[PDB]
Design a protein around this ligand. Structure first.
Ligand code: MET
Length: 520
């Protein structure tokens, strides 16, 4: 039993935070939140990648010091994430002095294992991606000036030739072990088609990887190689090490770091159970990272999950403005509902309003009000049910199964599928409620209404619970309206049908609603 350790990528600070980072961190936040709902220990991690030529040259373009630049843009990332209302346990910065120490330790470990030698890298590089590319991954294109140039096929950013004496890591020696790893743990990369991609690439063969650069090239904005101050550590080896650092940091409740433990086992976080990443940074996490860890004699992460978006890029979205307009919880819902493992996503205002109105308001919202309405629930309490009809049983079955199903989806992790599963059950509850016409039963048959109302109430409680990682603020409101005690708002014990007893009283009236419909 360990601390469930989930991470987001750490984002370059060349520019202000935008939708892409918010999305990536959201996914990390949800996975964390679900596992806390199951009553597990969690450590969710996010932060900023502050070294390198890319970041240095952005600070240069704004005619400001790297220290001041990175610190300002970091504060912006932090402000954005506080504003987005996540439940992240720590925000790491690669400029952190304890992080630097961890990198040198890891470097020293790889060096002592014999896996680092002085060689040369002569070949193409994308500064914007901080990525080495072979000639098969470039093509002709254009720069900001409008001259003919070479560009990455990965991303379309400008590439440049590099010929440097660099320290090299023996990546080629780890090809077979990475392959054994991919096959022995077929869940280790998600979604499955990116697992195939990684195997195909490693199958083809692996060159050694440049893990240092000449200090002139990086404008001295990087961690020096231990025992060689002429060289700086590759920004990506620096960056990937944040996962290790984060796993070794004791943090106060204020969120500030206060100690770096010698040994990761001390905090029971490492290795990560899930690395959330974008599709643009797959090779670093599924090829380079496991190879460093194997060299270092460290344990590998359990899962890498690579979503359909980019970690970084240029339907314009200031996440905070859209949240101020449509709602924080609803914006998160929409991003998680609309985004599959691809770019097949419609983020138009039209479709956002359709989903807000269609699902959040009409399906979930309406259901809460019906089962809490003074009209239908005249006693304002959880009634004790009478005998169940077959129709009752069928809905009860769906509700009884929902947690196990949603659980598996959350553990893939495929949040979209989890959301869809909950809402399938919400549609079912509405259909039942339409059939039973409890408004009519209030007069006709109060005993039958007890049964119908209780099942409805319980369907709403369980669905809301399983949606609580997605709608953290609104789940609280729903629970308050239903009058569910705090103790029952968490824990797998409360995944069970019938956890909240008959006679529980509902919360007081607000009459403000849950999700107001936006005009079309
Ligand atoms: C260890 S994850 C580093 C990710 C990189 N800074 C990016 O924004 O893509």
């Amino acid at each position: 039993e360990k601390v469930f350790f989930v991470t987001s990528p750490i984002y370059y600070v060349n520019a202000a935070p935008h939708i892409g980072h918010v999305y990536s961190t959201l996914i990390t936040d949800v996975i964390g939140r679900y596992h806390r709902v199951k009553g597990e220990r969690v450590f969710a991690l996010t932060g900023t990648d502050e070294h390198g030529q890319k970041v240095a040259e952005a600070a240069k373009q704004k005619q400001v010091s790297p220290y001041d630049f990175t610190t300002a843009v970091a504060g912006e990332f932090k402000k954005c994430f506080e504003q987005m209302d996540y439940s992240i346990d720590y925000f790491i910065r690669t400029t952190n002095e304890q992080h630097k120490a961890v990198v040198k330790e890891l470097w020293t470990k790889l060096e002592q294992k014999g896996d680092i030698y002085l060689g040369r890298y002569e070949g193409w590089y994308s500064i914007s991606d901080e990525s080495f590319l072979t000639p098969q991954n470039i093509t002709d294109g254009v720069d900001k000036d409008g001259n003919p140039c070479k560009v990455s096929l990965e991303s379309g950013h400008v590439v440049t030739w590099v010929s440097e004496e660099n320290y090299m890591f023996r990546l080629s020696a780890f090809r077979e072990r990475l392959l054994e790893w991919y096959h022995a743990n077929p869940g280790c990369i998600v979604p499955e088609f990116r697992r195939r991609e990684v195997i195909r690439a490693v199958e083809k063969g692996l060159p050694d990887l440049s893990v240092s650069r000449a200090r002139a090239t990086l404008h001295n904005w990087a961690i020096p190689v231990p025992g060689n101050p002429d060289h700086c550590v590759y920004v990506w080896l620096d960056a990937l090490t944040n996962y290790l650092t984060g796993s070794r940091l004791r943090v106060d409740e204020s969120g500030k770091e206060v100690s770096l433990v010698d040994d990761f086992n001390e905090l029971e976080r490492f290795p990560a159970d899930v690395h959330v990443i974008g599709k643009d940074i797959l090779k670093f996490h599924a090829i380079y990272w496991p190879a460093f860890l194997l060299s270092a004699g460290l344990p590998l992460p359990k899962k890498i999950v690579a979503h359909g978006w980019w970690t970084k890029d240029r339907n314009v979205f200031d996440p905070v403005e859209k949240a101020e307009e449509f709602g924080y919880d609803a914006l998160k819902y929409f991003l998680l509902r609309e985004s599959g493992f691809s770019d097949d996503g419609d983020y138009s205002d039209k479709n956002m309003i359709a989903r807000l109105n269609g699902e959040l308001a009409d399906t979930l919202g309406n259901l809460v009000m019906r089962c809490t309405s003074a009209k239908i629930n005249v006693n304002g309490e959880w009634p004790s049910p009478a005998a169940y009809t077959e129709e009752d049983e069928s809905l009860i079955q769906l509700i009884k199964d929902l947690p196990g199903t949603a659980d598996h989806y959350y553990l893939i992790p495929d949040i979209q599928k989890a959301i869809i599963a909950v809402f399938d059950v919400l549609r079912a509850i509405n259909a039942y409620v339409t059939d039973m016409a409890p408004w009519k039963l209030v007069k006709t048959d109060p005993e039958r209404l007890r049964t119908v109302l209780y099942i409805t109430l319980e369907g709403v409680r369980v669905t809301t619970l399983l949606l609580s990682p997605i709608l953290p603020r609104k789940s609280v409101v729903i629970f308050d309206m239903l009058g569910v005690p705090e103790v029952h708002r968490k824990g797998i014990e409360n995944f069970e049908f019938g956890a909240v007893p008959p006679g529980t009283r509902l919360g007081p009236a607000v009459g403000e609603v849950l999700f107001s419909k936006r005009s079309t």
